[PDB]
Amino acid sequence: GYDLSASTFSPDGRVFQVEYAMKAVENSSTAIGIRCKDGVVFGVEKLVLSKLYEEGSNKRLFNVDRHVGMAVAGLLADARSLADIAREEASNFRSNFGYNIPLKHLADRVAMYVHAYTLYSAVRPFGCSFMLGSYSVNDGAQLYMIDPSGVSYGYWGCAIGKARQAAKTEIEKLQMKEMTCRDIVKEVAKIIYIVHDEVKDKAFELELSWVGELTNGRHEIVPKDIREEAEKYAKESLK
Amino acid sequence: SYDRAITVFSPDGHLFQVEYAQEAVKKGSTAVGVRGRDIVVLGVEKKSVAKLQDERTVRKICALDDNVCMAFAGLTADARIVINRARVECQSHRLTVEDPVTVEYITRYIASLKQRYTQSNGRRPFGISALIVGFDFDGTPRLYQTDPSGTYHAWKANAIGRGAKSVREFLEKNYTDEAIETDDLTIKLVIKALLEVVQSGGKNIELAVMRRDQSLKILNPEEIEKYVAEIE
Amino acid sequence: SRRYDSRTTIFSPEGRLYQVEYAMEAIGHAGTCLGILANDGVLLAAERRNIHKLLDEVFFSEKIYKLNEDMACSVAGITSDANVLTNELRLIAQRYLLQYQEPIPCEQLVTALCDIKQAYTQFGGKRPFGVSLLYIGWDKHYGFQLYQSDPSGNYGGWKATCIGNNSAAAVSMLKQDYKEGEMTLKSALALAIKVLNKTMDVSKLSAEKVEIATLTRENGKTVIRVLKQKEVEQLIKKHEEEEAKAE
Amino acid sequence: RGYSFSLTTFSPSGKLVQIEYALAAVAGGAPSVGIKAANGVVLATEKKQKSILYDERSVHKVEPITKHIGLVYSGMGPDYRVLVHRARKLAQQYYLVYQEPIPTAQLVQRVASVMQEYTQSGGVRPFGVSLLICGWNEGRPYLFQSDPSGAYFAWKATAMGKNYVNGKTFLEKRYNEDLELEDAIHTAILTLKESFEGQMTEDNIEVGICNEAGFRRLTPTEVKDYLAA
Amino acid sequence: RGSSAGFDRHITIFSPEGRLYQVEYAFKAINQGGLTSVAVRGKDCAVIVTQKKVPDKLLDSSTVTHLFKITENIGCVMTGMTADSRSQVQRARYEAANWKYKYGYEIPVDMLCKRIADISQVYTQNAEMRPLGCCMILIGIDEEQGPQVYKCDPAGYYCGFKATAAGVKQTESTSFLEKKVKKKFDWTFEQTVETAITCLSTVLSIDFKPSEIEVGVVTVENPKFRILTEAEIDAHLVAL
Amino acid sequence: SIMSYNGGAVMAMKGKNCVAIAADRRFGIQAQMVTTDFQKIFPMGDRLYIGLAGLATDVQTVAQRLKFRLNLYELKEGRQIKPYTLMSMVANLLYEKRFGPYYTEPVIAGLDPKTFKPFICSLDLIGCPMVTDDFVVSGTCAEQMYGMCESLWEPNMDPDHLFETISQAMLNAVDRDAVSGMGVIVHIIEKDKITTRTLKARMD
Amino acid sequence: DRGVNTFSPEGRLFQVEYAIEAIKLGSTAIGIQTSEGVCLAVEKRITSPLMEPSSIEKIVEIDAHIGCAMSGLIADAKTLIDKARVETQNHWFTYNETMTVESVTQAVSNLALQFGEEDADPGAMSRPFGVALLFGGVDEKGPQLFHMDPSGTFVQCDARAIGSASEGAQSSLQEVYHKSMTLKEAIKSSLIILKQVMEEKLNATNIELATVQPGQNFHMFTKEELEEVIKDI
Amino acid sequence: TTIAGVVYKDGIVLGADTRATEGMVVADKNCSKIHFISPNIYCCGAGTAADTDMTTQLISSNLELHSLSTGRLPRVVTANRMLKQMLFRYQGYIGAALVLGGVDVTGPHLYSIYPHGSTDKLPYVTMGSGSLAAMAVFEDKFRPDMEEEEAKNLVSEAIAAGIFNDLGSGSNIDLCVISKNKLDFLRPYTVPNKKGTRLGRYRCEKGTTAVLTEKITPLE
Amino acid sequence: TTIMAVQFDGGVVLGADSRTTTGSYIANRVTDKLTPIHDRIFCCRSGSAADTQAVADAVTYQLGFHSIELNEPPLVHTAASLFKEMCYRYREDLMAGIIIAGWDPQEGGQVYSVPMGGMMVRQSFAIGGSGSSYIYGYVDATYREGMTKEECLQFTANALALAMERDGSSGGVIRLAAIAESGVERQVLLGDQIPKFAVATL
C-alpha cells in the first residue's frame, strides 16, 4: 500500500503518486516544441474526439505572458490551472520588478509550484507536463519543460505525450541550431504527422504557435497562410 | 482544528455513532420521571452505595433553573457538559426575556445541542438521555425526554437507563388519574417503578420531587424509606 | 488523512469509549495512591514507584503536587500527562482567586479539570489524559473533602478511595476498617499503612516506597505537610509491631 | 494542512506504544553517562563517528543551554537539536521575565512539557531522544533525565544509550555521595569504557562538566589528560 | 530483524525497534537519480565534483546542473530527487539571505546546514509530509575556521566533513577516499580537485571527458564560489 | 495628571538587616475621601511586601495580577521568591501593558529569604526598576518625602530607629499633601518578626 | 474507509444515497396541492401510550403562508425548518413581501449537499440531512407544494407522499387525484390513504393535519376538528 | 542623561551618568545606564529608561540565543541591526536612545541608535539630554587612535561636561572599556560631586512618633 | 541633505553631503548617504534617516535575493522598481526621498529619482534633498549632454558645494561615487577640496 499518497516513499525510494501522474501525461497526445536560432516553435497534435466540437475547442497552446507560450500535455483541467499559475507569476514579476519575466525564472517559479503538490497527502500531483518557450533580444530563444514531479530542464527540443520517444528521434535528426523559425514550422508539422497513429486515434487538428525574432518577441499562433503551407508540406513528405 | 466526519450514515440509513451513543444510555443507571397534576417526581437508581460515597456530588438529578430540573442516564461526564450549558442558557433567557424559561424551551436547547454533535465535524454525540421536568408560568407540569439523536418528546411518564424497557412497560400499565391524584401517591409511583429495576433492592435510590414555587428539594434517605415501608 | 487516523473519540458498538477504557488500564499498573478522609483532615498515601538507589531528592515529593493554599492532589497513570494537568489545575485555582478574591472551592476545581478531561474524550481527535488523580482539600462550604477523577472526565467525592495498582483490593479493605464520622487523623495514618501492606506485593514497607501528605487546619490556615522519612518509619513500626500483638 | 489527530494512542493493554517505541530509539543510541558529584555534574557521551572523514570539531552532542545548564542525549541526532534550541529559547524566556538565570529543575520541567506535547498533539511522533540535563543553581548540583514521554527524573547518576542497563549497574557500584567533580569524571569515562568496542581517544568521546563556575564542555586537550588515568 | 506494526510503512512514526522506517526510504530516493557527488576540502580550498549525465542529445546542457550558488560565498551540490533538490536550494538561498538581512553578516556554512537540517527534521516528525529525497553538500570559507564541507541528509543530520561523497557510489567512494585521509592531508592544496576527480573516476571506472562532470570550488584567495568551465576541467583532467 | 485622582503615598526605607515600608490610608476621588482604611501594602512573601500608589483601580488590579503570577511562581518553582525577582516580575507586568499603562508606581520592600539581605525597590508606571540602598518613595507627595527622607535617613539603623525615621517622614509629607493622609500604616520587616503599626495622623 | 464526499461507481454520492434510505424509516407524510389550497397530513407513529402526542410536531409553520411537513430524522429537520423561518423573515425585512413557496424550498435545499470534512466551515455539517420535507403553501402563483429530498433536488408536486409507506401511497395518490378537486375532498383523500398505510388504528391523536388556503393562513387542525373528518372516511 | 562612547586604538570606551529624574526631581542617585548585551558588546541607554531596559534586555537575550547557536562571539553589526529593525518596527513609540558599542572579530565598532530606528557608525557619539555638552568636549579634544588612558580621560571629561551643564545629568560617571582582551566595567569611575556633610542631627528618639494600634507577627 | 546623481556615457556619478540634522543641531557630520544596494547599484538617501535606512536595507535584501535566483547581475531599473514599490505602499508612513543610480550590462549607467510619494522617472541628472532647491538653476544652466567621468565629477562636486553653502541642513564633506563597468570609485572631498565660491565684497 505504498502508493496511495504523495507523502509516502516506496521501500526503494519512489513516490508512485508522482509516477502515476506522469502516466497521465503519457496517455495524452504528443506535443512538441523546438528551440531554434531565431525563436521557439510549438506544435500540438490535438486529438479532436467528436465531430461536434468547434475547431479550436480544448486549446493546448496557451499565452502565459506576452512573450511566453505554453504547450501542455496531460490532464487538461490541471493544465489550465497551471497556465493561470504561470500567468500570475508573470504578472507579479512585472508588478514587483517592472520588466518581462525571464523564462529561466518563470519556469522555476512554476516548477516549484508543481513540486509543492508532490509532498503532501492533502493534494495530488498535477497530471500534466508542459513546455514553456519565449524569445528576448537579450536572453535569446529559450525552451523549458516541466514534468509532474516538478523538474524543469532547458531543451533544444522536447516531445511530451504518447509518442514521446518516436518524436524525439525525429527532432534529433533536424539540426535546429542553425535553422530559422519559418523552416522549423514546416518541420514541426512533419514530426506531428509522422508520430500520429491513423489507426488508434482517428481525428486530429494541428495547433502551431511560435515565439521568435520575427514577432519582436511576441508569442502567437502561427497564421493559417503559414500553417496550411506547412500541413501541405508535411503530407507531401509523409507519402 | 479536527474536522472529520465522525457521525456518518451507513447502509440502511443508520447513524452508527448515534445508535452507539444510545447503547451508552442503556448501560447507565435507571432514571424515572412521572408527571402528576401539580407535582413532577424524578427518581434515579443508585447502582452501588458502597458506604464510601460522598453522595452529595454523584447526584443524578441536577437543577437547571429554579423551575426546571433534569435527571440523566448515560455517560456522566457528557451530562455535566449538558447540565452546565443548559444552566447558562436558562440565565441568558432571564437576561433577554425577563421571564423564567418554559420547560419545552430548555428541552429544545438541549435537543438541538445534542443534534449538533451528531452532525458537526470532529465530535461524537452525547452519550446521555435527559428526563427534564418543570412547571410553566401557567403552572402546568411538564415532563420531557431528550435522546442522543436530538429528538425530544413530552411524556406523562418515562424511563431511561438500564432496564427502562421493563420500567416503561410497568408505567404504561400503572399510570392512571388515580395514582397521579395525591402528591404522595405520585412519589410512590416512581419508587414502585424503580424497585422493579433495582436488582439488589432496598433504600439504594435517589429521588427528587419538585412542586410549584417553594421549588425543588431532593428527598433524604430516611425520608425515602418512609415511602418504601408504605409500599412493603 | 482518514487512513492514518485512529478515531480516538468515537463510540464502540457496545457504547464504550475505547481510548478512555484503555487509559483506565494504564492507571491500574501505575503507583498505588489512596486517600482517607478523617474528622480533622484528609491524607494521601501514594506508593512510590521511582525507588531506584541512584535517584535524587529535588522537589518536595514525587507524586503529590500541591495545587493551592488549601488543596493538594495526587496522581497515578502517565507521569507526563499528570504534569500537564497539574499546571492546569493551578491555573484554574488562581483564575478563581483572581476573579473572586476567595480560594477555589475544592469541588469547583475538580469539576473544571474534569471538563478539560471530558473535552479530549469528545472532540479534537486526541488521546485522553491517562491520569486518574486524587484530591484533598479544605473549603468554607463543606470543610475537608476528598475527590477522585478518572480519565473519562467524571469525578466523585469519597471518604476513602484508592487509585493505581491493586486498587480493587485496596478499596475492599477500606470498606471494612473505615468508620464514617469516627476516623481521627492518627487513626487514618495507621489505616493508610495497613492498606499499603496488603496491596503492595513486597514483604514490608520501608518509607522509601511510600509518600504520605496530610492536610489539616491550624489557627485558620490550611497546612499541607508531606511527612518525612522518620515520621512514616514510626508509623510502619507502629503497624509492624501491632500486627504481632494480634496473632 | 497538518494532521489534527494523535498518532500516539493507548494500546488495549494500556500503553502508549509510540512512546515505548521512541524509547527503543533511545536505547539504540550512543551511550551517555551523567554523574552528580558533591560540587559538580559531569556529562559524558560516546562521540564515535562512522569514518575518519567526519569532522569531530564540527557538531557537538554536549550542548550548553545557558551559562549554567548543559545537556546531552542518547537517541536521534536531529530530534535532539529541535529540542535543544527550544530549550535555549525557554531558558531566555524565563530570563526576560525574571532577570535571574533559570533553575535547572525549571528548565527540565519546561523541556519535558514540550516533549509531552508531541506525544499528544496532532500529526506528530514523539521525540526519539532522552536528555541528561545538568546545572548548578543555589549552590547545589542538579542532574535530570527527560524521557520521551515527557517524564523527568532527578538522578544522582544514570546512563542511557546502548548497554544502559549494564552501565547503570556499573554506576551503582562506583558512586560515592561525597565525591568531588574530578573524581566523578573518571568514573563517567569508565562507564563509557564498559561498552565502547574500541580504543577511546580524545576525539571518540565528549565530556561536559558543570560546577559553580558555570557549564562548559571539556576541550579535547583536557579530555586526553583524564584518559591518562 | 526489523519489526513493523501499524502505519510504520507509510508515515514517519516509530518502528517497534524505533527506526523511522519512512526516513530510511528517502535515502533510497537519493540513489534514484543514478548520480554521485564527491566533495573534499584542502587547506585553502574546498571542491565539489559531480557527474553530469546529459542523457538526451536535445537537452540544453547549460541547464542540466547540480551545482548551485547559494550566496556569493557558499556553493552547493545536490544529489537525489531533482525537484526536491531545487526546492531545498531555494530554501537555502532564502534562509541565507534572511541571515544577512537580520544579522548583517554573511551566513556561515555551519549555520546554513544547521537551519536546512532543522527544516528536514520537521518533515521526519510531522506525518503530513514526506522527507525530501535529496542531500545537500555545502562548501564555503569561514573567517576563522577556513574551508568547510558540510552535508545534510533527509534525516536532519548535518555533520562536517574533511571529504564527503553522496549518491550511488557513496560507499565505494567513502571507503576509497578515507584511505587518502592517511599521511598528510590528502594533498591539501589546489589539486584536491585531482583528489576529487580521481575519486569519482575510480568508482565509476569512467576516466571522464572534459564535459562529463562539473566542478565547483572555493578558495581562500577567491572566497567566491566558482563553477569551473570545461576548458578549466580539461586542464585538470589531462593532468591525470 | 491622572495618578493624582485617588491620591496616595507609599514609601519604603532600608535599615540594617531590616526594611520598613509605609503607606497612607486614604481612598479618594479628586478631592473627596470615601474610606480611611484603603490597603496599599500587600504581602508578596514571608518577609516581602509590595506597596502601590497611584490610581486606586490599578492599586487593586496590579496587586491581584501579581498575586496571580506569584502563586503560580511559588507552586511551580517550589520556593519563595527573592525580592530582586519580584521586581523583575512587576517590571514585566507593567511593561506588558505599556501603551495604555497601569497607573501605579509600586515600591517593593523585603528581605532576601536565605541571606536576610535588605532590599527596597521602586518602579515607574511602565516598569523601570530602581534599586536603592537608602529609600524609595512613590505617590502624590513624592517631592514632599524625597527631601524629607534625604535629611532623616541614616545608614545602618536599628529597627527602632528605622520606625521613628520612616514614620516621621511619612507624617510630615502627607500633612503637606492634600490628597494623601487620613492615617499612616507602617510595616517594619525584620528577620524574626513583622511589626505593623498604624499611627496617629491628622484626619483632614 | 471512504469519505463523506465520495461518488459511487454509479455516480450516486454514497452518503446522500444512504440519507435517502433513512427517510424510509420515518413516518408517512402526505401532501396534496389543489387549486383551493394545499393539505399536509402526517402519521405521528405513537411509540408509547405515555408519550404525549402534542409534542410530535411533524408539521410546522414556516411563515403565515407556508407550512412544512417532514419525515425521517426529525431532529435534522429542526435546523432546516429554522433556516426556513429565518429566510422568510429576511425576505420580508428586505422586500416587505411574503416569500414565495418555491424560493423557500430553493433556499433550504441549498443547505443539502453543503456538508464535508475539509475546511467547509469552522462549524460545518459532517453528513447530509436525513429528512424529506414537504413544503406547501399559497403564494402569488397560488397554492403550491414542493418536495425536498436530501440531495437538494426540489420538485413541485401536485400530490406527494413521503416516508416509510410512500411507495404505495404515491400509487394511491396517482389514482384519486385530479386537477379540479376541492380541499375538503383532498383532506378526505389524505386520510383514506393514511388509513391504508398506518399500522395503528387511525384516530385524531396519531395523525396531524394542516392546510394552507389562499384566504386564511396556515393552520393546524385541533382535536375537535379532526373528529369530523375521520367519521366521513 | 548623558551617555557617550569613543573608539581608541584597540578598543572602545563607553561612558554614562547615574542620574535618573522623574521630571525635574532626581529619583535615582546611582542609575546604571551602561547595559550588558554580550561579553564583547555593551550599550549605553538614554531617553525612556523603561524602554532602554526592555529593549537592550531583549537584544541581549536574542544574542544569547544567537551566540551559542553559532558557537562564536557575536558581532556589533548584529546588535545594531536587531536594534534598528526593532525600533523601526515600533516607529519611534519606544524611546530607546542607544550608544551600542563593542569589539568583535572585525574590530572595534560603535553605533548611535536613534529611537525611530536610524543608526550611524562614528568614532565618537553622545546621546541624551546632556549630549550637546558632551559633544563639545569630543569636537574639541578627540584625535584618532588614542591610548586607553587618553580615551578614558576624554569620555569622563565629556560625561562630566554633561554633568555640570545639563540639569538632567549628574551624580557619578560610569565607564566601560571594551577591548579585544579585557572588559573593564568601572561603575564608580569618578565621583565628581558628593553630598554635603550634615551640620546637624535630626534623629528622633524612640517614642517621638505616637502610634494608634500595633501588631507583631513573629516569623518561623 | 543634498543628494545628486549624474549619468555619463558608460556609467553614473553620485554625490551627497554628510550632514544629518536633528532640527538645527548637526547630529552627524560624516554620514555616508550613498548606500550600496548591490555591486554596481547604489542609492542616495534624503529625508527621514530611519525611513531611508530601512528601505535601503529592505531593497538590498530583495535585490540580492533576486540576483541569486536569476544568476544575473540585476538591472538598475529593477532596483529602482523595488524602491518605488516600497515607498508607494508606505507613502503615508515612510518619508523617504530616494535617487537610484547604477550600471548594468544591458542599458548602461542609469539614474532614477524616486521622490516622496513613490513615483519613478529616469533622468539624465537628478537632485534631491532639502538643499536641492538651491541649485536647480545651477544644474539647469551648466548641465551638458556628453560630459565625461571626470567632467561629471567636477559638476556634481560644484553643485553640492553651492548647496552646502546656502542650506543649513547641508554641509560637512562631499561624498562622490562613480559607478562604471569596472567598479565603484568612491572619494571624499574634505576641507579645502570642496570648491570655493566668492562671496560679495564690502
**Is C119:C85 a contact under the CB 8 Å cutoff?**
no
CB I53 within 8 A of CB H119: yes
Q: Where are the beta strands (DSSP E) in chain B?
A: 31-35, 40-44, 53-54, 68-74, 128-135, 141-146, 152-155, 157-160, 206-210, 217-218
Contacting residues of A for I80, CB less than 8 Å apart? 98
CA distance D222 to D219: 5
Q: Residue E184, exposed/middle/buried by CB under 10 A (0-12, 13-18, 19+)?
A: exposed
Asked if residues B17 and B181 have their Cβ atoms less than 8 Å apart, the reply is no
CB proximity list for A154: less than 8 A, separation 6 or greater? A104, A142, A143, A144, E59, E60, E62, E63, E64
Cell numbers found for residue D99:
532577570
Q: Which domains, ranges and CATH numbers included, belong to chain I?
A: 1-202 (3.60.20.10)
Complete DSSP assignment for A10-36:
-TTS--HHHHHHTHHHHTSPPEEEEE-
CB G153 within 8 A of CB G19: no
- Dist. CA E213–CA E49, nearest whole Å: 7
Could you give the count of Cα atoms lying within 13 Å of D57 in the half-sphere of its Cβ? 9
Q: How big is chain C by its Cα radius of gyration, in Å?
A: 19
Q: Helices D164-173 and D181-193, interaxial angle, to 10°? A: 140
Residue D41 bridge partners (DSSP): D36, D210
The residue segments making up the domain with residue D12 are 1-229
Q: What is the three-state SS of I52-121?
A: HHHHHHHHHHHHHHHHHHHCCCCCHHHHHHHHHHHHHHCCCCCCEEEEEEEEECCCEEEEEEECCCCCCE
Q: How far is G73 from I57, CA to CA, in rounded Å?
A: 64
DSSP-derived pairing of the beta strands H213-218 and F193-199: antiparallel
Q: Which of D151, D114, D145, D110 has the alpha carbon at shortest distance from D130? A: D145
Active site residues of H: 1
Single out the residue of E8, E15, E132, E3 nearest to residue E80, CA to CA: E132
Q: Please report, for chain G, the start and end positions of each structural domain, with discontinuous segments joined by +.
A: 1-233
Q: Cell digits for C207?
A: 518509607
What type of residue sits at position G213? Answer: Q
Please judge whether H112 and I93 are an interchain contact, meaning their C-beta atoms are less than 8 angstroms apart. no
Residues of G whose CB is below 8 A from B1: 122
Count, residues in chain B = 232
Reduced to 3 states (helix: H, G, I; strand: E, B; else coil), residue F185 is strand
- DSSP 3-state of E119: helix
Sheet holding I184-189, edge to edge: I125-128, I3-8, I11-16, I174-180, I184-189
Q: What gap in Å lies between CA F188 and CA H219, rounded to an integer? A: 13
Rounded distance, CA D21 to CA E2, Å?
Answer: 13
Task: Write the residue in H27, H94, H202 that is nearest to F152 by C-beta.
Answer: H202
Is residue A140 left, alpha or beta, with left meaning phi > 0 and alpha meaning psi from -120 to 50?
left
Query: What is the DSSP secondary structure assignment for residue G115, as one 8-state letter?
Result: B
Residue with cell 488590579: F61
Give residue for cell 498535477: A126
Give the chain B residue nearest C126 (alpha carbons). B2
Chains with 3 or more CB pairs closer than 8 angstroms to B?
C, D, G
Q: Pick the closest to residue D176 from D37, D17, D9 (CA basis).
A: D37
Residue H177 CB contacts under 8 Å (≥ 6 apart), including other chains: H11, H12, H13, H14, H148, H152, H183, H184, H186
What's the Cα-to-Cα distance from I160 to each of I3, I42, I132, I152, I164, rounded to whole Å? 8, 18, 8, 12, 6
Q: Are I6 and I125 in contact (CB under 8 A)?
A: yes
CATH number at D208 reads 3.60.20.10
What gap in Å lies between CA B193 and CA B158, rounded to an integer? Answer: 10
Max Cα distance, chain F (Å): 46
CA distance C94 to chain F (A): 6
Whether I156 is a known active-site residue: answer no
Q: Which grid cell is E213?
A: 562532470
Cell of B100: 423564567
What is the DSSP pairing of strand H183-190 with strand H20-21? unpaired
Cα B67 from Cα B105, distance rounded (Å)? 12
The CATH architecture of the domain made up of B1-232 is 4-Layer Sandwich (3.60)
- 3-class secondary structure for chain D? CCCCCECCCECCCCCEHHHHHHHHHHCCCCCEEEEECCCCEEEEEECCCCCCCECCCCCCCEEECCCCEEEEEEECHHHHHHHHHHHHHHHHHHHHHHCCCCCHHHHHHHHHHHHHHCCCCECECCCCEEEEEEEEECCEEEEEEECCCCCEEEECEEEECCCHHHHHHHHHHCCCCCCCHHHHHHHHHHHHHCCCCCCCCCCCEEEEEEECCEEEECCHHHHHHHHCC
**How, if at all, do strands G142-148 and B128-135 pair?**
unpaired
Residue I140 neighbours by CB distance under 10 Å: 9
Contact H61 D85 (CB under 8 A): no
Query: Closest Cα partner for A131 from A177, A87, A73?
Result: A73
For residue E9 the three cell numbers come to 510503512
Q: Are B133 and B33 in contact (CB under 8 A)?
A: yes
Domains observed in chain H: 1-220 (3.60.20.10)
* E103 touches I: beta carbon within 8 Å: no
Residues of E in contact with H71 (CB under 8 A): 110
Q: Report how far residue B24's alpha carbon sits from residue C21's, in angstroms, rounded to the nearest whole number.
A: 13
Could you tell me which of D228, D224, D229, D225 has the C-alpha nearest to residue D202? D224
Largest Cα–Cα distance of chain I, in whole Å? Answer: 64
| Three cell numbers written together for F155 | 545608614
Tell me the three cell numbers of residue F55. 490610581
Put simply, the answer to whether H88 touches I31 (Cβ < 8 Å) is: no
Domain that holds residue E47: 1-240
Domain F1-204 annotated CATH 3.60.20.10: yes
Torsions phi, psi for D143 (to 5 deg): -140, 125
Q: Which three cell numbers stand for residue E116?
A: 536546512
As a dihedral over the C-alpha atoms of residue H128, residue H130, residue H131, residue H132, rounded to 10 degrees, the angle is 140
**Exposed (0-12), middle (13-18) or buried (19+): which is F165, by Cβ within 10 Å?**
buried
Residue G188: CB partners within 8 Å, gap ≥ 6? G229, G232, G233
- The Cα of C4 is separated from the nearest Cα of chain E by a number of Å equal to 7
* F/H interface, count of CB pairs below 8 Å: 93
Inter-chain CB pairs, C–E, below 8 Å: 7
Q: How was this structure determined?
A: cryo-EM
**What CA–CA distances, in Å, run from D103 to D64, F116, I12?**
14, 21, 60
- Looking from the CA of A127 toward its CB, the CA atoms found within 13 Å total 13
G133: which strand partners? Answer: G70
Ramachandran angles phi, psi of H90, nearest 5°: -90, -5
Q: Is A215 helix (H, G, I), strand (E, B) or coil?
A: helix
Residues of chain H with C-beta less than 8 angstroms from the C-beta of F102: none
Q: How many CA atoms lie within 13 A of A156 on its CB side?
A: 22
The three cell numbers locating residue I89: 505602499
Q: Give me the phi and psi of D75, to 5 degrees please.
A: 140, -125
Interface contact C67-F65, CB threshold 8 A = no
Is residue G176 within a helix (H) or strand (E), and if so which, with residue range? helix G166-176
Q: Do chains C and E touch (3 or more CB pairs under 8 A)?
A: yes
CA distances from I78 to A98, I15, I83, I107 (A): 6, 21, 9, 12
- Integer Cα distance of F198 and F183 in angstroms: 7
Nearest CB among H25, H206, H219 relative to F46 is that of H219
User: Is-contact A60 A47, C-beta < 8 A?
Assistant: no
Q: Given an 8 Å threshold on Cβ–Cβ distance, is G123 in contact with B120? A: yes
Structure letter (DSSP) for residue I172: S
Residue I37: count other Cβ atoms within 10 Å of its Cβ.
Answer: 25
Could you tell me the three cell numbers for H220?
Answer: 518561623
Q: Which of E208, E51, E55 is nearest to A172 (CA)?
A: E55
Sign of CA pseudo-dihedral I189, I191, I192, I197: positive
Test H68 with D88 for CB contact under 8 angstroms: yes
Distance set, CA C121 to CA B61, C11, E164, I3 (Å):
23, 10, 51, 69
Which CATH fold topology does G1-233 show?
A: Glutamine Phosphoribosylpyrophosphate, subunit 1, domain 1 (3.60.20)
Which residues, at least 6 apart from G30, have a Cβ–Cβ distance to it below 8 Å? G39, G40, G41, G42, G69, G159, G160, G161, G169, G173, G190, G193, G194
Q: Where on the phi/psi map is residue C236: left (φ > 0), alpha (ψ -120 to 50), or beta?
A: alpha
G48 Cα to chain B: minimum distance (Å): 8
B24: helix, coil or strand?
Answer: helix
Helix, strand, coil shares of chain B, percent, nearest 5, are: 35, 25, 40
How far apart CA C212 and CA C41 sit, in angstroms, is 13
Task: Tell me which H or E stretch contains E233.
Answer: helix E230-237
Taken as a whole, chain A contains a residue count of 239
Touching subunits of H (3+ CB pairs, under 8 Å) are D, E, F, I
Q: Do the beta carbons of residue C123 and residue B2 sit within 8 Å? A: yes
Neighbours of A46 (CB within 10 A): 20
Strand order in the sheet with I96-104: I34-36, I41-47, I96-104, I108-114, I121-122
Single out the residue of G69, G62, G47 nearest to residue G166, CA to CA: G69
User: In a 10 Å sphere around its CB, with 0-12 CB exposed, 13-18 middle and 19+ buried, how is residue G170 labelled?
Assistant: middle
Per CB-CB distance under 8 Å, the chain C contacts of F78 are 59-60
Min Cα separation F46/chain C (Å)? 14
**CATH class of the A1-239 domain in this structure:** alpha beta
Q: Classify residue H103 by its DSSP letter.
A: E
Which CATH entry fits the domain spanning C11-245: 3.30.750.24, 3.60.20.10, 1.10.238.10, 2.40.50.100? 3.60.20.10
The residue extents of the domains of chain F are: 1-204
Asked if residue C53 lies in contact with residue D172, where contact means CB atoms within 8 angstroms, the answer is: yes
State the catalytic residue, choosing from I1, I21, I31, I35. I1
**Could you give phi then psi for residue F186, rounded to 5 degrees?**
-130, 130
Torsion over CA: G163, G166, G172, G174 (sign)? positive
Distances (CA, A) of C238 to B144, C243, G90: 59, 9, 80
C-alpha cell at G157: 408536486
Grid cell listed for C30? 501505575
Beta strands in chain C (DSSP E): 33-37, 42-47, 71-77, 131-139, 143-149, 155-158, 160-163, 210-217, 222-226
Q: Which residues of H touch D95 (CB under 8 A)?
A: 61, 64
Query: Cβ(D208)–Cβ(D215) under 8 Å?
Result: yes
Please name every residue paired with C137 in a beta bridge, in sequence order, or none if there are none.
C71, C145
State the Cα–Cα distance between residues A155 and A124, nearest whole angstrom.
27
Tabulate helix, strand, coil % of chain H (nearest 5). Answer: 30, 35, 40
Q: Do E105 and H66 touch (CB under 8 A)?
A: no
Closest CA to B119 of B146, B81, B150, B82: B150
Residue reference for cell 550512543: D30
Distances (CA, A) of B185 to B71, B204, G167: 20, 20, 49
Max alpha carbon distance in chain D (Å)?
56
Sheet strand arrangement including F193-199? F135-139, F9-14, F19-24, F184-189, F193-199, H213-218
φ/ψ of residue C136, rounded to 5: -125, 145
Identify the CA nearest to G58 among candidates G134, G150, G109, G112. G134
- Residue F96 belongs to what H/E stretch? helix F83-96
Question: In chain C, helix, strand, coil percent, each to 5?
Answer: 35, 25, 40
Contact criterion met (CB below 8 Å) for B131 and B42: yes
